[PDB]
Amino acid sequence: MECYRCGVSGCHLKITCSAEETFCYKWLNKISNERWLGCAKTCTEIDTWNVYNKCCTTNLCNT
Known part of the structure; x- marks a missing residue:
């Protein structure tokens, strides 16, 4: 499966999550215009007031 990470100037990068992630x-x-985009094992959704984290189990679900 491939995800969508954010480089240093771009936010449309297609990476490959090893069989691990x-x-x-x-x-x-x-707040800090910073986002944590990538593949992980579990989910850590963070829907607060300023932070919004969403996990997916499909393809490029983070774009």
Whole structure:
């Protein structure tokens, strides 16, 4: 499965999650304009007031 990570200037990068990671987590920090996009094992959804993290089990579900 492939996900969508964010480089240093771009946010449309298609990476490949090894057989180890099959989850697509996309966290957004409406404070430090910083987001944690990548593949992980479990989910850590963070839907607060400024932060918004969403995990997926499909393809490029984090774009």
